[PDB]
Chains A and B, each alone.
Chain A
Amino acid sequence: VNIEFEAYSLSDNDYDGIKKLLQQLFLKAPVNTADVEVFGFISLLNLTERKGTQCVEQIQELVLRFCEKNCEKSMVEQLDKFLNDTTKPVGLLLSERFINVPPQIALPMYQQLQKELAGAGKCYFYLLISKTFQVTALVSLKAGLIQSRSTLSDFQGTFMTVGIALS
């Protein structure tokens, strides 16, 4: 099972709105303590569980809806439901066991996901906006479902979500 979505056609405020969407998600979870912009999360999932597959049905549906023609300004609103609707699998999975790691933890996780995504078992769910500048040279929204190698360092659990915030 593989689902991968990339979009390089976001507007500056589409990015800026999603960044606010992700930031409230960071504030709502417990916080742990022990150029380019990147913000998002990497959620580990188990596909033999009802919760694992019930999430995929919503994730797969969101990507299908993102594949529509004039569906660009709706990205900010469709994501508002997606990750904040606790009456739904993905919005509920992000309210439970969401953890905020410092950037020294997040950068290794981002970089391995960037490696695992480039070259053709643990099901990972990621949503990742990114900006490259001052000005804005490119804005990218990547989000997908992949089965790969360990990005977590045994430090993450199943249905545990890890926050990404790189600046």
Chain B
Amino acid sequence: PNVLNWEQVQRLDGILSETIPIHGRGNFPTLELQPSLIVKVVRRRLAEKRIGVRDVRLNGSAASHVLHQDSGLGYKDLDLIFCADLRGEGEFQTVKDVVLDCLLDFLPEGVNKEKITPLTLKEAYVQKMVKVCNDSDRWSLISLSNNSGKNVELKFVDSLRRQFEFSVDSFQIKLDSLLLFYECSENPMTETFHPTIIGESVYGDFQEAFDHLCNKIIATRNPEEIRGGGLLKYCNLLVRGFRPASDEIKTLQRYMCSRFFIDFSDIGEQQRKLESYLQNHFVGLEDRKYEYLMTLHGVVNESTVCLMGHERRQTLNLITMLAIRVLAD
């Protein structure tokens, strides 16, 4: 039911055995990391500090990619979620420490490791570091950097309120089966000898979400976590070929418009979020830039039945202008 087939498993094994370049600033080598090695060494070194880890999973695009290549969401970034009840004792700091002392071991031979502090490793290879312990949320993040665009994010999550956006980013694929396979057998993976791997979805049933990813169907639940980007995210799927399922998008397609106007009330604000969204998602793709603004145009027009035009007319015009300025260039 949830078990990946030989194709899906092959896709998973490929991206977790890729060697990813992790570039460093200044007088530091480039780091060559295999995602499966990161999962092993981190989990072992964490265990040596008596810090427990429930499981390790894959998230977002890479998960959607292994389940369906043709979805087009693409495998661009690797996101590894370490599920660990990090309750007390400043365990969030020892996690920060363990990751940094794993980065030390992955260094190429020929580095005088004695001059390398944890802080110098941080300033060398780390791109982002986030820690959040507010209300129901307890989670940490260490984003490793790569000059070529790829982003190897290491997430340590005790508890997180909303773990998805739409149905096609909701899949999470456990990796413990795959890692145990590599230790147990010297024989390589075949169509008959491959591990049993279970896909899960943070939004309802895996079978429901898998059929949406396969038929290209835009679906979502709990829209109370919507944002101004929710409207933009909605169009990004729609222009890639995704379609809604015709089930009460009535309040939803108004909420995204309603929440995007609230989040971006100024005309200047809207033009900056739109111009930024175009280049940060469709660089060089001026055919997809145009077709995006056209899909965003029609969505805002037909969905926003809002009687007031102060937000509608001015918003609708910013889309028309940018569609033309993109076209005429």
Residues of B within 8 A of A70 (CB): 280-281
CB within 8 Å of A: which B114-134 residues = 122-123, 126-134
Q: In the complex the two chains form, what is the Cα distance from A137 to B90 in whole Å? A: 31
Q: In the complex the two chains form, what is the Cα distance from A137 to B25 in whole Å? A: 8
Q: Is the CB of A3 within 8 A of B127?
A: no
Q: Is the CB of B90 within 8 A of A77?
A: no
Q: Is the CB of B26 within 8 A of A137?
A: yes
Q: Is the CB of B134 within 8 A of A56?
A: yes
Closest to B276 in A: A74
Q: In the complex the two chains form, what is the Cα distance from A8 to B144 in whole Å? A: 11
Q: Is the CB of A120 within 8 A of B131?
A: no
Cβ proximity bits A61-76 to B, threshold 8 Å, 1 near / 0 not: 0010011111001100
Question: Is B92 an interface residue, CB under 8 A from the partner?
Answer: yes
With A8-B126, A137-B26 already in contact, the answer to whether A2 and B272 are too (CB < 8 A) is: no
Main secondary structure of the interface of B (DSSP, over half): mixed
With A69-B151, A77-B272 already in contact, the answer to whether A3 and B132 are too (CB < 8 A) is: yes
Residues of B within 8 A of A5 (CB): 128-131
Partner of B132, one of A60, A68, A120, A140: A60
Closest to B97 in A: A120
Residues of B within 8 A of A77 (CB): 272, 276
Whole-angstrom distance between the Cβ of B143 and the nearest chain A Cβ: 8
Q: Is the CB of A120 within 8 A of B130?
A: no
Question: Is B93 an interface residue, CB under 8 A from the partner?
Answer: yes
Residues of B within 8 A of A16 (CB): none
Residues of B within 8 A of A96 (CB): none
Question: Is B9 an interface residue, CB under 8 A from the partner?
Answer: no
Q: Is the CB of A1 within 8 A of B280?
A: no
Q: Is the CB of B128 within 8 A of A7?
A: yes
Whole-angstrom distance between the Cβ of A61 and the nearest chain B Cβ: 9
Whole-angstrom distance between the Cβ of A133 and the nearest chain B Cβ: 13
Partner of B280, one of A2, A3, A73, A81: A73
Q: In the complex the two chains form, what is the Cα distance from A76 to B72 in whole Å? A: 31
Q: Is the CB of B132 within 8 A of A63?
A: yes
Q: Is the CB of A73 within 8 A of B276?
A: yes
Q: In the complex the two chains form, what is the Cα distance from A66 to B134 in whole Å? A: 16
Main secondary structure of the interface of A (DSSP, over half): mixed
Question: Is B145 an interface residue, CB under 8 A from the partner?
Answer: yes
Question: Is A9 an interface residue, CB under 8 A from the partner?
Answer: yes
With A69-B77, A137-B26, A138-B123 already in contact, the answer to whether A63 and B276 are too (CB < 8 A) is: no
Q: In the complex the two chains form, what is the Cα distance from A5 to B143 in whole Å? A: 12
Q: Is the CB of A3 within 8 A of B131?
A: yes
Question: Is B141 an interface residue, CB under 8 A from the partner?
Answer: yes
Residues of A within 8 A of B128 (CB): 5-9, 67
Whole-angstrom distance between the Cβ of B23 and the nearest chain A Cβ: 11
Whole-angstrom distance between the Cβ of A62 and the nearest chain B Cβ: 12
Residues of B within 8 A of A56 (CB): 134
Whole-angstrom distance between the Cβ of A123 and the nearest chain B Cβ: 11
Cβ proximity bits A2-19 to B, threshold 8 Å, 1 near / 0 not: 111111110000000000
With A69-B77, A70-B280 already in contact, the answer to whether A63 and B130 are too (CB < 8 A) is: yes
Q: In the complex the two chains form, what is the Cα distance from A138 to B25 in whole Å? A: 8
Q: In the complex the two chains form, what is the Cα distance from A74 to B279 in whole Å? A: 11
Residues of B within 8 A of A3 (CB): 131-134
Q: In the complex the two chains form, what is the Cα distance from A1 to B133 in whole Å? A: 5
Whole-angstrom distance between the Cβ of A119 and the nearest chain B Cβ: 8
Q: In the complex the two chains form, what is the Cα distance from A69 to B128 in whole Å? A: 11
Task: Enumerate 16 A-B pairs (CB-CB under 8 Å) in ascending A order.
Answer: A1-B133, A3-B133, A4-B129, A5-B131, A6-B126, A7-B127, A8-B123, A9-B128, A9-B145, A60-B132, A67-B141, A70-B280, A70-B281, A74-B276, A77-B276, A137-B26
Chain B contacts to A: CB under 8 angstroms: 25-26, 77, 90, 92-94, 122-123, 126-134, 141, 145, 151, 229, 269, 272, 276, 280-281
Besides A56-B134, A60-B132, 16 more A-B contacts (Cβ < 8 Å) are A3-B132, A3-B133, A4-B131, A5-B131, A6-B128, A6-B129, A7-B129, A9-B128, A60-B134, A63-B132, A67-B141, A68-B229, A73-B280, A120-B93, A138-B26, A140-B123
Chain A contacts to B: CB under 8 angstroms: 1-9, 56, 60, 63, 66-70, 73-74, 77, 81, 120, 137-138, 140, 144
